[PDB]
Amino acid sequence: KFPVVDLSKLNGEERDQTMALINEACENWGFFEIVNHGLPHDLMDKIEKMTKDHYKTCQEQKFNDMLKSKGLDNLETEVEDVDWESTFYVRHLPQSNLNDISDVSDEYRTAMKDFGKRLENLAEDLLDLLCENLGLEKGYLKKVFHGTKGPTFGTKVSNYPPCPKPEMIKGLRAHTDAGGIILLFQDDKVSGLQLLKDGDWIDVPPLNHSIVINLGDQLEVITNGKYKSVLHRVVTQQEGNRMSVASFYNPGSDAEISPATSLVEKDSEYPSFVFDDYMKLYAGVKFQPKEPRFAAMK
Amino acid sequence: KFPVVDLSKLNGEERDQTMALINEACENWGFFEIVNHGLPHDLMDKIEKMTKDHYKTCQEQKFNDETEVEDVDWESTFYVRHLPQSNLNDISDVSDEYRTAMKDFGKRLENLAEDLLDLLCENLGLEKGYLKKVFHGTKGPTFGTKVSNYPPCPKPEMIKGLRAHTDAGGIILLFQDDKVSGLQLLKDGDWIDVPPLNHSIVINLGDQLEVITNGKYKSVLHRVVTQQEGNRMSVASFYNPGSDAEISPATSLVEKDSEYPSFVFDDYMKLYAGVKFQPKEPRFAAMK
Amino acid sequence: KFPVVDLSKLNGEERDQTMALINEACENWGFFEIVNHGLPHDLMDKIEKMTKDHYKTCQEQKFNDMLKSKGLDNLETEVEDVDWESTFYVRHLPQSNLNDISDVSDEYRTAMKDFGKRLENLAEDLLDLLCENLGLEKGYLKKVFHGTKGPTFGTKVSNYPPCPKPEMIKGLRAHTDAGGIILLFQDDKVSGLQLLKDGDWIDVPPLNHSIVINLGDQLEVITNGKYKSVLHRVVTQQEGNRMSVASFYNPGSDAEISPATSLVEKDSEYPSFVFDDYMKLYAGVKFQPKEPRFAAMK
Amino acid sequence: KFPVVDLSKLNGEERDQTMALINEACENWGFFEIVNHGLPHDLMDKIEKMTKDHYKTCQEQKFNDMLKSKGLDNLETEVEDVDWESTFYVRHLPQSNLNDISDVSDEYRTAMKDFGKRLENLAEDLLDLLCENLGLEKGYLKKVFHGTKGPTFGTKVSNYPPCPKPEMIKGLRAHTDAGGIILLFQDDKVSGLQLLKDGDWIDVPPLNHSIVINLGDQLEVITNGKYKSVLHRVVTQQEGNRMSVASFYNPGSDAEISPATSLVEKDSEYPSFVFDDYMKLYAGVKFQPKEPRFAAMK
Amino acid sequence: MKFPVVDLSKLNGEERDQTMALINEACENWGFFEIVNHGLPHDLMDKIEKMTKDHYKTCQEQKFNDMLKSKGLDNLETEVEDVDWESTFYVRHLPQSNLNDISDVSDEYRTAMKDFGKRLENLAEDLLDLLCENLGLEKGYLKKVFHGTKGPTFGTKVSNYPPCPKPEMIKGLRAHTDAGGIILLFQDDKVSGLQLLKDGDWIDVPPLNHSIVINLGDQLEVITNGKYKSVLHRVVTQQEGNRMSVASFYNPGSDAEISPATSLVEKDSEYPSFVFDDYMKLYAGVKFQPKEPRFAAMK
C-alpha cells in the first residue's frame, strides 16, 4: 500500500506515529503522498485548471511541432531516446523568471507565485522532519542546501498527452532525480507516474488535493545511503492527458554536499562534492544508471 | 466551358480579350479561375502542405464528433482575421511557420483582390479605385481567411459539404484543392463543377458587388458536395467592405430607379448571419 | 525550353509539327513530356494517392531504419555512393510479381495493373512514332524488343523523402537508363529530376497529369547514335517528398539488339549483342560512364 | 580599438575566443575586419589593380560627366543630396550580368567571378558563425535567406576620387545597409569609411589584405535587435582616390524575414515581412532614418 | 500605450506631485504629450483656427495648387520622398518680430497671432520650469541656457495639409526630429495626421479640441544627457480633410552655449557641447536625415 501521510497529525499526540510513517516511507519507498498539507484546495484547483488551459493555449501546438520534428507521428517501433512529454520550467529561486515567461496569463503567474512560495515553505518544513527522523540538528539540511545564494527552487510544469501506441514510448523514461526534495502536484484522474520497488513498477496513485513527495540524489549522499533516491517513470496511455506540476528544492550551486558525519561510521561509499559539479554531469546522463554519477564525484 | 483567365495576358495586345473574358464571367458565371496571378507557386505549395497537415494534427480527431441531413455542413473549419486587425498570432493551434506563411499569403491576396476590383472597375466604366473607396468605411476593408477541409463522407448523397448559398461580401479569392473536387456553382439550371486546377485561384463575387453594379454582376449560388474518399482543402479569403461602409448602386450604372437597396454593410452582415442558407432576394428587400 | 508534346495534336493538322518536335527532343534532349496521352486523370490521381499513402504506411520507417543502419543520420560530409531513395520494383512482363509485394492493398494492386497495361500500350504507340521519325517500318522497334517471351516491362515506385542537407547526398546519382523507353509519372509539386544538356543540369519540370518520356541505352544502339540516352539524376531537397512511378519498356532478355541497318551507312561504332548480357553488366556499373558498356559488348 | 578577427584561429583551440570577439563586434560595433580569411593575396592584389585601372579607363569619364550635369565642379557651399562617388554594380546571384558589362576586360571578369564565389562562400561561413553565437540551428540564416531563387549576391565597385573641398560633400552619406551581410574589400592606403559608435564617427582603418564585415537591416530583424545595423558613411579628402569593392549577400526577393522565435520573449518590436517589399521601400528612403522603415513593414 | 494627456490645472492643488510625475514619464517615454486646461483662452484658439483656415482658402490654396503645377505633382504616378505635401508660412516673434511684414494677413489675424504667441511663449517658459523641477535643475536653468545674448528664438509655423488624392505616394511632412527646445502645437481638432514613432510603431497624436501638443527638440536631448530624447514624427496626408497646424518653436538664442547639464553627467557624455547656431546651420541641410550624425558633427 502506497504511503499516504496526514500532515495535520503532526500537531498533536499522533505526531510520533506520523514521523515514524514518514521515516519508513523515506527508507523503503523513496516516495510518499501527503494530505492536509496546508495548501488551499482552492489554489490547487485553479493551478490545475490554468495549467490545463495553458496546455491547450500554449503547449499543445509546441508538442505536436515536436512529434513532427522527430517523426513520432507514427510509432511502429519502440522509442527509447525521447519522452512523450510537454514541459516548460518556472524558476523561483534564487532569481525568479516568472514575470518573463511571455505566454502565461497574469492570474496564472499570480497563482504560480503563491503556489511556489507555499511549496517552498512546505519543502523546508519537510526537511526539518527528515532532520528529526535522522537525528540531525534542526535546520541542518536547510543550511547544507543554502550555499552562497540560497537554495535553487523551480517548478516543472508538464503534460503527458494521450499516446496512440503507449507500448512504444514512455511519457518520461526511468530515472532518479538529481536534487534534494521534490513536491509534486499531479493529475487526480489520469494515472501514469510509477516507482520501482522490490523489482516491481508501482503506481503512484492519483489522489485529490494531495502532494507527492520524493527524495533526490543529494539526500541519498547526505544520509549516507539511509534514504535512497528511487527510480521512477511516467507511462503514457491512449486516453487521457496527465497533468504534472513538480517543484524541485535543490541545493545552491556552490553548496558543499557530503555525508553527514553523525550518519557515517565506516568510511562512506558516497562522495563529497559541490552540487553544481553534480548537476553539470547529471544533465547529460540523466537516463543512465545513478551509481556511476556518485563514483564520478570522487 | 468554365472561365479560366490568364492574368499574364493583361499587359499587351492580349488585354482586350482578357478583359472581355473577365467581364463575361462576372456577368454570366459569377465565378472564374485565374492563372499566372503573381502568387509564388512555392508559397501556395507551403500553404497547401501546412493546411493539410494542420488538419491531421489539430482537426481530424475532433471531427469524430441514415437519412438526408439538410441542416448540417460536412466541414472542418477555422477562421483567420487579417484586416482591420489580425488575430493570426492568437490562434492557438497554428505553428509559427504556418503563421508566417499565412501572413505573407494574406498580404499578397489582399493586393490581388484590389487589383481584381480595379479590373472590374474598368469593365464597369467606373473610375479606378472606386470599389476600393466604397469598401473602405472608417477602418478599411474587412479581410479574413476561412480554412476548411471537407473529409470523406460514407454517404455523400445524405449531406452536403456546404449547403447552397451566396456570399455576403465583396470579392472572394479561393485556393482550393487541386485534386479533390466538390465546389459547384448554379448556372442556367445546372450545378457546374468548379474544376480543381494546380496553382490557380478561384474568384467569385459576393452580394455587395451585385448591389453596387445594380445587378450587372450577380452573386451566384454555390455549394460543396462531399465524396466517399478524398479530403478537399479550402483556403478562402473574403475581401469585404468595412463595417460602416455605405453600399449602394453606383450612380453611373443606374439609368432607371434601381431595385437594389442602399444600406450600411454591417446591417447587411448582421442579418446575413442568421439567414445564410435562405434565399438571397429577401436580404436585399430587408435593407429597404 | 523543355519539350512538351501534346499528343492530341497528332489528329492531325499540326501532326507534322508534333512529329518534328518529338524528333528534336529525341535527338537533342533525350527527354520530353507528353500531355493528352489518353491515361485517365482519375487513375493517375488514385495511383499518386495510394503511392504516397503506401510510403507513409510501409516505407517511411523502413527508410529511417536504413538511414541509421548506414549512418546517413549524420551528413557531415559528402556521400557519393548512396542514393537518398525509397524504392520497390513491380514486374509486369513477361511474368508479373505484382501479387508478391505483400504490404500493398488489393485496390493499389488492381490500380497498378490497370495503369501498367495502359502505359504499356502508350509505350508501344510512342515506339511507333519513333519508327516513323526514323524512317523505320511500323512495328520495327516492338518486334526487335520482343525476343521469345515478349518485352520486359516493370515499374519502379520511388519516393525521395526530405533531406536535411541536400548538398551532401543525391536522391539518385547521375546515370543513363539501360533499357528502351521510360515512361515516368512524377510528383506534380516536388521537383528533383534533372537531365544533363549542353553542359548544364536542367530540371524536368513537374507538370500535373503529364508523363515524362526518356530513351534508354538500347535505343541509342538501335538508332546508331541518332537518339542518345541522356544522363539524369534526382536531387534531394529539405522539404518535400518527391514521388516517382517510372515504367521501363525494355527488350526481352534474349532479344538481339543491333543498329538498324537502314540507319547505318559508315560502319557502326555501336555493338550487336543480346539484351540480357547488357543488363547483367549494367547492374554492376550503373553509375559509372555509359560509353565503356557499349565497348564491353564487342 | 576597432575589432580585427583572425579567422584562421577558428580551426583550433582558440576558436571560442575568436567566436566571442565576433559576437562582441556584432553586438557593439556592427562592423569588424577579418584577416587570414580564405582569399589569396594575389587575387586581392589583382582585383585592386584592375579596379583602379578600370576607374581610369572607364569610370573617370562618367564621373566628370556626373559633375558636369550636377554642377559640382566648384563647391561654394554644402551639398547634402548627392554622393561624391563613382560606381558600377556587378550581379552574381541569382543571375550574373558579369558577361554583359561591356567595358570590363576578360581577365577582370575572370578575377571578379573568382572573387565573388569566394566571398559568397565566406558570407555563408560567417552566417553560420552568427547562428552559433545566436544559439540558432546551423544553416538557419542561409535557409531564411534562400526564398525560391536563392540569395541575392552582387558587388558594388566604387571609387571616391579626391574632392577639392571635402567639407562640402560626402563620398557617401550616412546610412544603414538594407541587406544581410556585407563584405568589403577597401583601399589599404586611402581611408574614408566611418561608422557611428557611442556618439562618435570612428574610422574603419585601411588594412592590407583584409575584409571589412558589417551587418544590414535584415539581420537586425532576424536577431530581434540583438545585432543592430549601424550607420556608416564615406568622407572625401583632397588627395587620394579610395577604392571600394563591396559585396552584398541579401535574402532572395520572396524570402520571409521575421525575428527568429528563439530570440523573442516579449512581443517583438520588429516586423515580419517579405524582403522585396523592404527593398522597394528602402531604395527611395536610403538616407532617411532607419527606424521608420521597420514601422512601415507592419 | 494610451497617448499622454496632462491636465495642467492639477498643478495648482493637492495633485501637483502626481501631475509632475506624469509629465516626467511622457518626457522620458513619449517625447510628446497633450496638455488641457493650459490657460490659453478657448475663444482665442477658436479665432486663430478660423482665421488660419480662412487665410489658407483665400490666400494659400491658389499658391498650393500652383506649387503642384510647377513641380508636376498633379500626377502622383510614383512615390515622392523629397517633397512635403504642405502649405506653410513662418512668423518670427523673437528676437525680432516680422509679424508686421507679412503682407497677406489681416490686421485682426496679425493681432490675434501676436497675442497667441505671447501666451505660448509664457507657457513655454512655464513648461521649461516644470522640466527643470523634474530633472533636479534649478528654477530658470533652461530659460537661462536658452537666452544667449539676445534672448531665445521664438517663431510660429502656420501650416495646412490639404487633401491629397493618393496619400500613399507623398507625406504631408517627412519624418524628422525638431532641432530646437520645446515645441507647442495647436493642431486641427477634427483632421488627424501627426504621428510619432514609439517602440517601432507610428502612433497618431489624436486631435483633441482646445488642447496643445507639446514635444521636445534635439537641444533638450543634449541638455538632459539623453534622459529626454527628441522623437521622430511625421504628418501623413488623407484623401479628404485639410489638417491645420499652428506650431510654435521655443529655441535657444543663436549664440547660446548648449551642453549636457553638469549634475546629470556622472560619466563622460556621448553628447557634444556646441553653440546653437552651428547646430541650426547644419540641421537646415540634413533635417530629414538621421538625428545621431548631427550630434556627432558637433564634436
Ligand SMILES: O=C(O)c1ccccn1
Ligand atoms: O519530472 C520528473 O523528473 C519528476 C516529476 C515529479 C516527481 C518526480 N520526478
Ligand SMILES: O=C(O)c1ccccn1
Ligand atoms: O465558404 C464559402 O462560403 C466559400 C468558400 C470559397 C469560395 C466561395 N465560398
Ligand SMILES: O=C(O)c1ccccn1
Ligand atoms: O530511376 C530511374 O533511373 C529513372 C526514373 C524515372 C525516369 C528516368 N529514370
Ligand SMILES: O=C(O)c1ccccn1
Ligand atoms: O556602399 C555601401 O553602402 C557600403 C560599402 C561597403 C561597406 C558598407 N557599405
Ligand SMILES: O=C(O)c1ccccn1
Ligand atoms: O513642423 C514640425 O516640424 C512640427 C510641427 C508641430 C509639432 C512638431 N513638429
Ligand SMILES: [Zn+2]
Ligand atoms: Zn523525476
Ligand SMILES: [Zn+2]
Ligand atoms: Zn460561399
Ligand SMILES: [Zn+2]
Ligand atoms: Zn534513370
Ligand SMILES: [Zn+2]
Ligand atoms: Zn552601406
Ligand SMILES: [Zn+2]
Ligand atoms: Zn517637427
